[PDB]
Subunit: 305 residues, 4 copies
């Protein structure tokens, strides 16, 4: 069947929601892969029954063998151990193992990396898998901006999706939030600030909140996995359905912002041909300085893998 | 049942698509009303069967009696005769007749006016129906900008919805297209122009195309009714589901842009409380001059009704 | 792009709704083809703008040249002149012309025939196009049963889709309604009759209503095209998304019900491989007698083409 | 806002998926309530961001105070300790506490009970909350039959939703699977058995699999919560949107099947008025004997609470 085959390399919390959302949207057949014995089979069985409730027809199966990567159209990697820097070499080993199988079983698959630090892990897998630069991206901006877009929408009382924002450079503490590129209903946010509808102080607090959301969720005795999963599926769906959505993801930089041979967060266009366009925001020197900071941290960690 | 009741006052071409789209989205019960005998019943019967194909449960009935306006949550007016100025007094008579029944049968319904010239006809109905200012709007910007957003998206090869634009003042020849407020993926269009991805000349042609689309469709031996219907439903749905989307519609101006006691196109926020916010774009003197032109034409025609 | 290409051979009323529904569901690129100059271009332009309102990315274009059949994944034929028997030879000529181009431009496309009498016209196109038997079907049962399912659901006050029914043999006056195969929520209808929830007399009236619905809609000064379009799209979507839905359509009979070398309405399974299964209902002699009647009328008209 | 308010009393695994699915479907505002400090707030924050990805506008908040039950339109109870019979009195205490607050804060809310044993726990809450019989149901048949419908659909290679089946009496080991009431595309399953498309032996194995699915998932080192959540949402959605779907749920029996003053699984119709119809299947003596067995076990456990 010409039905897309989506292999989720890692059957943890994010993997579970991704599987659920795929069936809900009837995106394609799903394989929940992991090295943990049977668990992926158990989650796959549970999820497979939702086909009835959702009027879908997507096979959902578990797997403990890399062989099931064969025929994969899309591969989503969430696998990985969770100082923080001590995991770098370890997770690189996981990227190496996965990359070798991708190269052997599905060299033409579209890859989405989630493993943290994503900006580092994505380039590592790109290198070990050998896939073209336009066929591999990392999760970052879609998730990070969903927080900023959401918090602003609540203050302004408008549909969350009506707020657009851009966070670039890298996923994580060094993420670059661009106040200048925020709009509401397509209108520059500054107009709403001029109107006293939202203050600069309110925005600064929202910015800090955005950068520290994962930490905030963790401190509330939970962990972020639902939004990450939803952000990942928006990306995968844009590719599978050739939507050509403009989404901020970690992609290989070839001179943009003055950086090369490194992956960084920036808006790109995802369609049937993968990363069809890499958009370079015309940042000013101040924003560029922050982007530089993001890249520096990515390079720092890359060197330790 | 707490199911919304949507009464379509006018069962023509736009009315038919609206009915179809309502069932597709299971938005609520539909009444296709018109003075033409039986036709609304015939279209209603045809459309009612689609409930099976769409897994919906919306009653779709025809009507030839104004009494069916009772219990209406949303009323959509497309009725109206189609120089052009000679129809003004005639269509005003239709607005008067409809307004009297709305006032009597559903004073708390949310009204959307389509009848042209919409900016004139909407204020007339507002006056004859007596509903609050936040409960009546006219179709305009959503439809007009859908053209501009779509044409630009094709030139740039991105998802149509990713292009945001603003057309204000009035629906029609005097519509004000604001080049300065166009974005792609939330990014100012000017950046794409600086990049040679789209030229100023290309945009000028797209602008003219946008203003003359209805005429273009008519010259191709067709008439626009599908997009208008879809634009209307996006508006009605934002209200019914309390989405709080920022949509450009004709609303009563109370000083915005320097105009009062007149309806004009401008972004507003539609939610459970109707027009929850009227957004005033901070236009420069040049854009304001064009808006003035739009209002002037509306006043001109209003005076002839 | 791996986006499906759907060519609508005939840009009339049914064609328009199909185009609209395809964009709503983001099913694939659409081509509105017809011999009428420009009209398809005009309808295509109007419909194309709805991509913004629906968050879709489907190209919608018009066409006046058969060449655009190239690359077609799905072809839907509604073209055709509308005694009634005098049109048979004329419409056969249309089927011949279309069939020659399908054979030349898209021999592997999946074909859905709507032209009436569908059961006759579908076999004619099958013959002239040369496509495999599993790649061509005619619209019939999905539309006819949607009426029966809907009317029964209203009497019983249950979701329309919860009522399942089977109408076979042929589309049209000789359609075979099988009372014995009607269920509500999967429960045999007879149980509801035993319960006095619906009477046999009520059902008989609903049956007559079902058979005469087109005529009823026509007498109300309208024409059925919305449900037909929706029924057609349910079929096309099952194929495109490999849903494997059980849908009653006109398919080539190879001995089922005692008939061969003729097309007739019967439940089939539509998936990525087209007609993946032809299901033969185990009818009793009485039901079989009626089916025979349906086939006889189809053969009668086939002989006059 | 006239937006429905859904309070999830219990913020565990099933609660999380329910919250996620509600936003995906934009069903209404969600409150994740639990006695565990902050966790519901953490899950609520994570889930709230998905509003952007799903184009929804549903508030998702956590809560540690029963007061938030005020204004609730729908209340879903999953809270509860997890011999097995020793938990009965304990879980009854939870039902009592919740029931008192429902009675005080939202007496007109529609209640769905999940806590096991559901058939027992649902009647207990019905008693402690005092809500009308038509406003409270327990999860059972929708989940159980989704397994049976799914397994059969895979053997027959048809859309999962096209297989309809009925499991009644009680949720759990004593569930009554009715082979006689299974259909495929509305066609009696027996016809497919006569055709050798599926054997009686295959079905017997599927039956055992259906009854032991939770156990099977648990043995694979997982736990069922995704399907349960999806089944619950289908029920809640039928009520909220007045779909009037026929769904098998635990409801108060008033003489049906010969049982009274007890809750049992049976098809019902859920609409704006809650349980609008309780459907009694015309079971034979053999099926009735099994149903009796189910009720007996429910009564046994009820007596120990
Ligand atoms: C002792 C166990 N070892 C080595 C035999 C297993 C392999 C270890 C490294 C390479 N890979 C992994 C380690 C841990 N988890 C993983 C999850 C997925 Cl999905 C894929 C690979 C993983
Ligand atoms: C001769 C016929 N006349 C007067 C009796 C009918 C009423 C005329 C004016 C007021 N109204 C109308 C005229 C024409 N079309 C309409 C469509 C709708 Cl939906 C509602 C009112 C309409
Ligand atoms: C005089 C005009 N003639 C002959 C040149 C045109 C061709 C006539 C027959 C074969 N075909 C047709 C006749 C009428 N309508 C049609 C609509 C479609 Cl979409 C496709 C073919 C059509
Ligand atoms: C020692 C802690 N006790 C008593 C103070 C808390 C209350 C205990 C019983 C009645 N209720 C409960 C016990 C355990 N979990 C629950 C989860 C939810 Cl959502 C609601 C009520 C719960």
């Amino acid at each position: 069947a010409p039905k897309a085959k989506i292999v989720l390399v890692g059957s943890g919390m994010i993997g579970g929601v991704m599987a659920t959302l795929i069936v809900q949207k009837n995106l394609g057949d799903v394989v929940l892969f992991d090295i943990v014995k049977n668990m992926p089979h158990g989650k796959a069985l549970d999820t497979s029954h939702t086909n009835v409730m959702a009027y879908s027809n997507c096979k959902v199966s578990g797997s403990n063998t890399y062989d099931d990567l064969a025929g994969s159209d899309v591969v989503i990697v969430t696998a990985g151990f969770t100082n923080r820097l001590d995991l770098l070499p370890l997770n690189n080993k996981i990227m190496i193992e996965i990359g070798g199988h991708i190269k052997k079983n599905c060299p033409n698959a579209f890859i989405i990396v989630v493993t943290n630090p994503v900006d580092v892990m994505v380039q590592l897998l790109h290198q070990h898998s050998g896939v073209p630069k336009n066929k591999i991206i990392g999760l970052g901006g879609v998730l990070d901006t969903s927080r900023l877009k959401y918090y602003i929408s609540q203050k302004l009382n408008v549909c969350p999706r009506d707020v657009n924002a851009h966070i670039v450079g890298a996923h994580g503490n060094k993420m670059v939030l661009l106040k200048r590129y925020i709009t509401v209903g397509g209108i520059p946010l500054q107009e709403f600030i001029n109107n006293k509808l939202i203050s600069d102080a309110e925005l600064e607090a929202i910015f800090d909140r955005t950068v520290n959301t994962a930490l905030e969720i963790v401190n509330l005795h939970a962990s972020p996995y639902v939004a990450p999963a939803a952000a990942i599926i928006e990306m995968a769906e844009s590719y599978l359905k050739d939507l050509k959505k403009v989404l901020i993801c970690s992609t290989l930089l070839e001179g943009q912002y003055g950086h090369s041979d490194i992956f960084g967060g920036t808006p790109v266009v995802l369609g049937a041909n993968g990363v069809e366009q890499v958009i370079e925001l015309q940042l000013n020197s101040e924003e560029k300085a922050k982007f530089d900071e993001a890249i520096a941290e990515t390079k720092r960690m890359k060197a330790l893998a």
